Amino acid sequence: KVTTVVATPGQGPDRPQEVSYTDTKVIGNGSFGVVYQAKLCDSGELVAIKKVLQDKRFKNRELQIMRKLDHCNIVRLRYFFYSSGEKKDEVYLNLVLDYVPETVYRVARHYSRAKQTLPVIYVKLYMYQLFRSLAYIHSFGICHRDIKPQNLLLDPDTAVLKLCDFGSAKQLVRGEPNVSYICSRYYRAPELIFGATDYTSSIDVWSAGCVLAELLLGQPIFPGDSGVDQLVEIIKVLGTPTREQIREMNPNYTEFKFPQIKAHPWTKVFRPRTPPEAIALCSRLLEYTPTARLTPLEACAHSFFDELRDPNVKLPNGRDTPALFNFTTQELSSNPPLATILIPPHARIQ
Ligand SMILES: CS(=O)(=O)N1CC(c2nc(N)ncc2-c2ccc(F)cc2)C1
Ligand SMILES: [Cl-]
């Protein structure tokens, strides 16, 4: 069995190409539609096809975003094509994406079942690359709005992390309100829990912080099946938000008091041997006030990631770390002066 379609490439000019794929497996499916795996007939490479029902009145926001994006820490849209087949007057948008075997979710859980934590070196590598991808998309004013371990793809050999699933992603314009029900359970910023509709891209930074803390703890940091339950687990760590903090998160005062608990020292949250810099980084990501959180780029420049800027740094398997320093002007526009930290001396050699 061999499907052949005429697809438009994700990047580059509109040059339609005959794409032929086989071994059409299935994997996940939910809020969008089905997701298949396949093998491309020529190159032999594996790819993931995300099929979704196409709306006639508007064009697909995921597609529109995916096409603008080109970055080595973000899944590549290789092609896209429209199809249907059988019952209904339904048009399906198919997104052909690079297949990436593992996810931070699966990896984290392997370590968690075996009562281990992921070696800090991998925490650094994975977290740094996430923050790069955030710095990039945020530079276009695009918020992902669903940062969680399941959406962080990993190549285990190269230690390369790629952000994926832009189904929730959106251009956040100041003054324009946005839906407050977007982020997944454990990774929602307090302002989202409080139902704020004037949130900024800092929600991604909170989410990322929840991933960091989770990789350090070996389990979700702010669990709970309700918002109430989540906010309690948060307050247990951060302490009770001041009236100031509360108005910063959500001006539309949903309106009620919380149990006055003081901040359980961040040091006592983690294992004894946990690097003090990792803890420091957490506390600067997981802040009540959206504007007080680090930017993605400021996070990349955090001391916690110093080891990665060492010229001698290698992966435990002996291979080189992936390219961490080739920042574009786009990536740096947030705050160009930071390049003095981000790009280390040995990366400037001619
Ligand atoms: C709908 S989705 O593409 O966002 N979702 C992520 C996941 C995925 N995406 C790509 N591009 N490549 C691989 C995978 C994936 C990885 C591990 C696994 F067990 C299942 C799917 C499927
Ligand atoms: Cl042509």
Short mmCIF file of C-alpha atoms and ligand atoms in Angstrom, two decimals:
data_model
loop_
_atom_site.label_atom_id
_atom_site.label_comp_id
_atom_site.label_asym_id
_atom_site.label_seq_id
_atom_site.Cartn_x
_atom_site.Cartn_y
_atom_site.Cartn_z
CA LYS A 1 0.00 0.00 0.00
CA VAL A 2 1.37 3.41 -1.15
CA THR A 3 -0.46 6.75 -0.96
CA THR A 4 0.76 9.47 -3.31
CA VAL A 5 -0.32 13.10 -3.02
CA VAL A 6 0.60 16.49 -4.41
CA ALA A 7 1.61 18.58 -1.37
CA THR A 8 2.68 22.21 -0.78
CA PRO A 9 6.01 22.54 1.15
CA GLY A 10 5.70 24.25 4.56
CA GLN A 11 8.60 26.63 4.04
CA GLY A 12 9.83 28.05 0.73
CA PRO A 13 7.81 29.10 -2.37
CA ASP A 14 4.59 27.35 -3.55
CA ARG A 15 6.26 24.52 -5.56
CA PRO A 16 3.84 21.54 -5.42
CA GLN A 17 5.58 18.15 -5.11
CA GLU A 18 4.58 14.53 -5.56
CA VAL A 19 4.98 12.96 -2.10
CA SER A 20 4.61 9.17 -1.77
CA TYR A 21 4.35 7.50 1.68
CA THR A 22 3.75 3.97 3.02
CA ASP A 23 3.57 2.08 6.38
CA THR A 24 0.66 4.29 7.47
CA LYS A 25 0.55 3.59 11.23
CA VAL A 26 -1.71 5.35 13.76
CA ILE A 27 -0.76 7.20 16.95
CA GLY A 28 -2.59 9.71 19.20
CA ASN A 29 -5.88 11.52 18.45
CA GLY A 30 -8.10 14.06 20.25
CA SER A 31 -9.25 17.71 20.09
CA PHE A 32 -8.03 18.06 16.45
CA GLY A 33 -8.57 14.68 14.76
CA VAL A 34 -6.35 11.68 13.88
CA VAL A 35 -2.52 11.56 13.81
CA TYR A 36 -0.82 8.92 11.58
CA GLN A 37 2.82 7.89 11.29
CA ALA A 38 4.26 7.07 7.85
CA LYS A 39 7.43 6.29 5.91
CA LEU A 40 8.36 8.40 2.86
CA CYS A 41 9.08 6.17 -0.16
CA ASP A 42 12.18 7.98 -1.54
CA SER A 43 14.22 9.08 1.52
CA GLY A 44 12.90 6.31 3.80
CA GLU A 45 12.35 8.88 6.57
CA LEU A 46 9.51 8.71 9.10
CA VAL A 47 6.91 11.51 9.33
CA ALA A 48 3.80 12.32 11.33
CA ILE A 49 0.60 13.35 9.56
CA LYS A 50 -1.88 15.44 11.58
CA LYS A 51 -5.30 15.30 9.87
CA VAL A 52 -7.94 17.88 10.88
CA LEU A 53 -11.40 18.92 9.65
CA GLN A 54 -11.06 22.11 7.61
CA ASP A 55 -13.44 24.98 8.30
CA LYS A 56 -14.73 26.72 5.15
CA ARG A 57 -15.26 30.25 6.65
CA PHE A 58 -11.73 30.70 8.15
CA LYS A 59 -8.35 29.17 7.22
CA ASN A 60 -6.49 26.94 9.70
CA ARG A 61 -4.58 28.97 12.36
CA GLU A 62 -2.13 26.11 13.06
CA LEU A 63 -1.13 26.01 9.37
CA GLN A 64 -0.86 29.82 9.19
CA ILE A 65 1.48 29.75 12.21
CA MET A 66 3.49 26.62 11.26
CA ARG A 67 4.34 28.18 7.84
CA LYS A 68 5.83 31.33 9.48
CA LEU A 69 8.05 29.23 11.79
CA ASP A 70 11.58 28.03 10.99
CA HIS A 71 13.75 27.09 14.00
CA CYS A 72 15.73 23.97 14.92
CA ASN A 73 13.93 23.70 18.30
CA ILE A 74 10.44 23.57 16.68
CA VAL A 75 8.97 20.68 14.64
CA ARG A 76 9.21 21.30 10.88
CA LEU A 77 6.13 21.34 8.67
CA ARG A 78 7.67 19.41 5.71
CA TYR A 79 4.48 19.59 3.54
CA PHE A 80 0.74 20.06 3.80
CA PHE A 81 -2.08 18.85 1.56
CA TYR A 82 -5.92 18.75 1.57
CA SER A 83 -7.96 15.53 1.21
CA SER A 84 -11.29 13.84 2.06
CA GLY A 85 -12.53 10.35 1.03
CA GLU A 86 -15.91 8.62 1.57
CA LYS A 87 -18.88 10.00 3.61
CA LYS A 88 -19.61 13.75 4.06
CA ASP A 89 -18.72 17.02 2.32
CA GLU A 90 -15.66 17.32 4.55
CA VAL A 91 -12.26 18.73 3.54
CA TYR A 92 -9.29 17.48 5.68
CA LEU A 93 -6.11 19.56 6.13
CA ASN A 94 -3.15 17.16 6.44
CA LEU A 95 0.04 18.45 8.07
CA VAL A 96 3.17 16.39 7.32
CA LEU A 97 5.65 16.87 10.17
CA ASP A 98 9.04 15.43 11.05
CA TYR A 99 8.61 12.31 13.25
CA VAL A 100 10.54 12.55 16.55
CA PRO A 101 10.51 9.29 18.56
CA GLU A 102 10.48 10.30 22.26
CA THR A 103 8.86 13.02 24.35
CA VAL A 104 9.88 14.63 27.64
CA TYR A 105 6.64 13.04 29.04
CA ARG A 106 7.70 9.43 28.21
CA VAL A 107 11.32 9.99 29.30
CA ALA A 108 10.35 11.73 32.55
CA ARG A 109 7.91 8.86 33.34
CA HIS A 110 10.57 6.14 32.66
CA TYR A 111 12.79 7.80 35.32
CA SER A 112 9.75 8.33 37.61
CA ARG A 113 8.60 4.63 37.53
CA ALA A 114 12.23 3.56 38.22
CA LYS A 115 12.34 5.99 41.23
CA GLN A 116 15.14 8.00 39.50
CA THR A 117 15.45 11.63 38.43
CA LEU A 118 16.69 12.65 34.98
CA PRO A 119 20.41 13.66 35.15
CA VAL A 120 20.63 17.48 35.57
CA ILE A 121 22.72 17.77 32.39
CA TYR A 122 19.62 16.66 30.35
CA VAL A 123 17.39 18.98 32.43
CA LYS A 124 19.69 21.88 31.39
CA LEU A 125 19.84 20.83 27.75
CA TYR A 126 16.04 20.24 27.38
CA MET A 127 15.02 23.34 29.34
CA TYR A 128 17.46 25.68 27.47
CA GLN A 129 16.13 24.49 24.09
CA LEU A 130 12.51 24.96 25.19
CA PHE A 131 13.30 28.54 26.23
CA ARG A 132 15.01 29.16 22.84
CA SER A 133 11.86 27.96 20.99
CA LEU A 134 9.79 30.23 23.27
CA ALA A 135 12.08 33.25 22.67
CA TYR A 136 11.63 32.61 18.89
CA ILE A 137 7.81 32.23 18.75
CA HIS A 138 7.31 35.01 21.33
CA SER A 139 9.38 37.33 19.10
CA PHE A 140 6.55 36.97 16.53
CA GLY A 141 4.06 37.70 19.36
CA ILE A 142 2.85 34.07 19.20
CA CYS A 143 1.97 32.29 22.47
CA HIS A 144 1.94 28.48 22.46
CA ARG A 145 -0.66 28.24 25.30
CA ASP A 146 -0.14 24.47 25.83
CA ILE A 147 3.41 23.94 27.04
CA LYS A 148 3.56 20.55 28.74
CA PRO A 149 5.92 17.51 28.62
CA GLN A 150 3.78 15.69 25.97
CA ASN A 151 4.46 18.55 23.52
CA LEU A 152 8.26 18.44 23.98
CA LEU A 153 9.75 16.01 21.45
CA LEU A 154 13.24 14.53 21.94
CA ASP A 155 15.81 12.81 19.79
CA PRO A 156 17.56 10.67 22.46
CA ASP A 157 20.88 10.43 20.52
CA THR A 158 21.38 14.13 19.71
CA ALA A 159 19.61 15.48 22.83
CA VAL A 160 17.69 17.89 20.56
CA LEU A 161 14.34 19.09 21.87
CA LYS A 162 11.61 20.30 19.52
CA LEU A 163 8.42 22.07 20.59
CA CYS A 164 5.27 20.77 18.83
CA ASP A 165 1.44 20.98 18.76
CA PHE A 166 0.55 24.57 17.78
CA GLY A 167 -3.19 23.76 17.79
CA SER A 168 -3.76 26.17 20.72
CA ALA A 169 -1.11 28.69 19.57
CA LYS A 170 -2.13 32.26 18.85
CA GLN A 171 -0.92 35.80 18.12
CA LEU A 172 -1.58 37.77 21.34
CA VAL A 173 -2.31 41.44 20.59
CA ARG A 174 -2.45 43.85 23.61
CA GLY A 175 -6.05 45.00 24.24
CA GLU A 176 -7.62 42.04 22.37
CA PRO A 177 -9.08 39.53 24.89
CA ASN A 178 -8.37 35.76 24.69
CA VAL A 179 -10.05 32.63 26.01
CA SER A 180 -8.97 31.59 29.50
CA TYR A 181 -9.56 27.80 29.07
CA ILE A 182 -6.45 27.00 26.95
CA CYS A 183 -3.69 25.37 29.01
CA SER A 184 -3.47 21.74 30.25
CA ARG A 185 -4.13 20.71 33.87
CA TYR A 186 -0.84 20.98 35.88
CA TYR A 187 0.81 23.71 33.68
CA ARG A 188 -1.80 26.57 33.86
CA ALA A 189 -0.57 29.96 35.10
CA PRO A 190 -2.54 31.36 38.09
CA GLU A 191 -4.02 34.13 35.90
CA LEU A 192 -5.51 31.40 33.66
CA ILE A 193 -6.97 29.62 36.72
CA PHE A 194 -8.47 32.99 37.78
CA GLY A 195 -10.06 33.15 34.31
CA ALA A 196 -8.15 36.24 33.13
CA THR A 197 -8.55 37.07 29.43
CA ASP A 198 -5.83 39.78 29.28
CA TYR A 199 -2.89 37.31 29.82
CA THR A 200 0.39 37.64 27.87
CA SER A 201 3.03 35.21 26.62
CA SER A 202 4.26 34.89 30.21
CA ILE A 203 1.78 31.99 30.56
CA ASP A 204 4.25 29.91 28.51
CA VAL A 205 7.03 30.90 30.94
CA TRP A 206 4.95 29.67 33.90
CA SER A 207 4.20 26.43 32.03
CA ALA A 208 7.92 25.96 31.22
CA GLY A 209 8.72 26.54 34.91
CA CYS A 210 6.27 23.76 35.80
CA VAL A 211 8.14 21.44 33.41
CA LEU A 212 11.51 22.40 34.95
CA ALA A 213 10.30 21.81 38.53
CA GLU A 214 8.70 18.51 37.41
CA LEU A 215 11.92 17.16 35.87
CA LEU A 216 13.67 18.11 39.14
CA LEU A 217 10.98 16.64 41.45
CA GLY A 218 10.16 13.56 39.36
CA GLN A 219 6.46 14.48 39.56
CA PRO A 220 4.13 17.44 38.77
CA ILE A 221 4.74 20.38 41.14
CA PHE A 222 1.18 21.84 41.21
CA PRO A 223 -1.25 18.89 40.81
CA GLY A 224 -5.04 18.84 41.42
CA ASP A 225 -8.23 17.95 39.55
CA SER A 226 -9.75 21.40 40.19
CA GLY A 227 -8.40 24.96 40.02
CA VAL A 228 -9.08 25.20 43.76
CA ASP A 229 -6.84 22.19 44.35
CA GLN A 230 -4.14 23.58 42.04
CA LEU A 231 -4.11 27.07 43.63
CA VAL A 232 -3.72 25.40 47.03
CA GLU A 233 -0.61 23.47 45.92
CA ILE A 234 0.74 26.75 44.48
CA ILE A 235 0.07 28.77 47.64
CA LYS A 236 1.79 25.99 49.64
CA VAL A 237 4.98 26.82 47.70
CA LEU A 238 4.78 30.52 46.74
CA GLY A 239 2.74 31.58 49.78
CA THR A 240 -0.51 33.54 49.76
CA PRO A 241 -0.71 36.18 46.97
CA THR A 242 -0.91 39.83 48.14
CA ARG A 243 -3.93 41.92 46.98
CA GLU A 244 -1.35 43.57 44.67
CA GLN A 245 -0.29 40.22 43.15
CA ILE A 246 -3.97 39.21 42.84
CA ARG A 247 -4.95 42.35 40.80
CA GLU A 248 -1.83 41.85 38.60
CA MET A 249 -2.87 38.25 37.73
CA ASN A 250 -6.55 39.02 37.22
CA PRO A 251 -8.13 42.52 37.53
CA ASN A 252 -11.69 41.06 37.16
CA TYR A 253 -11.58 40.05 40.90
CA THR A 254 -13.44 36.69 40.80
CA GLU A 255 -13.49 37.54 44.52
CA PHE A 256 -12.55 35.35 47.52
CA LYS A 257 -10.00 34.99 50.37
CA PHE A 258 -7.36 32.19 50.63
CA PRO A 259 -5.80 30.38 53.66
CA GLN A 260 -2.93 32.62 54.91
CA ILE A 261 0.08 30.30 54.41
CA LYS A 262 3.66 31.65 54.21
CA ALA A 263 6.17 30.58 51.52
CA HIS A 264 7.68 27.12 52.13
CA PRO A 265 11.36 27.86 51.28
CA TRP A 266 12.11 26.79 47.68
CA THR A 267 15.23 24.91 48.93
CA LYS A 268 13.06 22.58 51.06
CA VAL A 269 10.85 21.81 48.00
CA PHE A 270 13.50 19.72 46.20
CA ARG A 271 15.96 16.82 46.85
CA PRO A 272 19.00 17.79 49.03
CA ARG A 273 21.60 17.60 46.15
CA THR A 274 19.45 19.75 43.77
CA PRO A 275 21.66 22.53 42.25
CA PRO A 276 20.91 25.92 43.93
CA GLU A 277 20.81 27.58 40.46
CA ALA A 278 17.99 25.25 39.27
CA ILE A 279 15.98 26.30 42.32
CA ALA A 280 16.81 29.98 41.69
CA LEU A 281 15.59 29.67 38.09
CA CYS A 282 12.30 28.03 39.23
CA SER A 283 11.52 30.88 41.63
CA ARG A 284 12.05 33.49 38.83
CA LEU A 285 9.77 31.56 36.41
CA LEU A 286 7.04 30.61 38.92
CA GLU A 287 6.07 34.13 40.06
CA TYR A 288 2.43 35.25 40.65
CA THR A 289 2.95 38.57 38.83
CA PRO A 290 3.11 37.83 35.05
CA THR A 291 5.49 40.76 34.36
CA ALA A 292 7.93 39.69 37.14
CA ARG A 293 8.72 36.34 35.40
CA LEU A 294 11.89 36.02 33.29
CA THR A 295 11.50 36.32 29.54
CA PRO A 296 12.42 33.11 27.63
CA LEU A 297 15.69 34.80 26.53
CA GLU A 298 16.57 36.00 30.05
CA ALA A 299 16.05 32.37 31.14
CA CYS A 300 18.46 31.05 28.50
CA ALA A 301 21.02 33.50 29.99
CA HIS A 302 20.40 32.24 33.55
CA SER A 303 23.36 30.88 35.56
CA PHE A 304 21.68 27.44 35.68
CA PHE A 305 22.63 27.05 31.99
CA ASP A 306 26.34 28.06 32.44
CA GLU A 307 27.56 24.46 32.06
CA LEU A 308 26.09 24.49 28.51
CA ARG A 309 28.26 27.55 27.60
CA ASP A 310 31.45 25.73 28.68
CA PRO A 311 33.56 24.83 25.57
CA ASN A 312 34.38 21.36 27.02
CA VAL A 313 30.75 20.37 27.65
CA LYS A 314 29.77 17.07 26.06
CA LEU A 315 26.73 14.78 26.25
CA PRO A 316 27.17 11.74 28.59
CA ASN A 317 27.24 9.53 25.43
CA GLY A 318 30.43 11.38 24.38
CA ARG A 319 28.82 13.24 21.39
CA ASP A 320 28.73 17.04 21.04
CA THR A 321 25.82 19.03 22.45
CA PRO A 322 23.54 20.46 19.69
CA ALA A 323 24.02 24.05 18.42
CA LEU A 324 22.98 26.25 21.36
CA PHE A 325 24.47 29.61 20.30
CA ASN A 326 23.52 30.41 16.70
CA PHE A 327 20.93 33.02 17.71
CA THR A 328 19.33 35.05 14.89
CA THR A 329 18.59 38.78 15.20
CA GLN A 330 14.92 37.72 15.32
CA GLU A 331 15.60 35.47 18.35
CA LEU A 332 17.51 38.28 20.13
CA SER A 333 15.17 41.24 19.39
CA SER A 334 13.49 40.76 22.76
CA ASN A 335 16.78 42.17 24.22
CA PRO A 336 19.91 42.14 21.95
CA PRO A 337 22.45 43.10 24.71
CA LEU A 338 21.92 39.59 26.18
CA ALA A 339 24.00 38.17 23.31
CA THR A 340 27.07 39.07 25.43
CA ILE A 341 25.99 36.25 27.79
CA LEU A 342 24.12 33.96 25.37
CA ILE A 343 26.95 33.71 22.82
CA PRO A 344 30.03 32.62 24.84
CA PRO A 345 33.63 33.71 24.00
CA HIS A 346 34.60 30.43 22.23
CA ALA A 347 31.61 30.70 19.85
CA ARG A 348 32.94 34.03 18.43
CA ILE A 349 36.21 32.48 17.16
CA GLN A 350 36.75 33.02 13.41
C1 LIG B 1 -0.77 15.92 17.32
S1 LIG B 1 0.84 16.10 17.65
O1 LIG B 1 1.58 16.04 16.41
O2 LIG B 1 1.02 17.41 18.20
N1 LIG B 1 1.33 14.99 18.73
C2 LIG B 1 2.70 15.16 19.26
C3 LIG B 1 3.10 13.75 18.83
C4 LIG B 1 4.23 13.62 17.87
N2 LIG B 1 4.46 14.58 16.94
C5 LIG B 1 5.48 14.48 16.05
N3 LIG B 1 5.66 15.47 15.15
N4 LIG B 1 6.33 13.42 16.05
C6 LIG B 1 6.19 12.43 16.92
C7 LIG B 1 5.16 12.45 17.87
C8 LIG B 1 5.06 11.31 18.82
C9 LIG B 1 6.13 10.98 19.65
C10 LIG B 1 6.04 9.91 20.53
C11 LIG B 1 4.87 9.15 20.59
F1 LIG B 1 4.77 8.12 21.46
C12 LIG B 1 3.80 9.48 19.76
C13 LIG B 1 3.89 10.55 18.87
C14 LIG B 1 1.72 13.67 18.19
CL CL B 2 4.25 24.61 -10.88
#
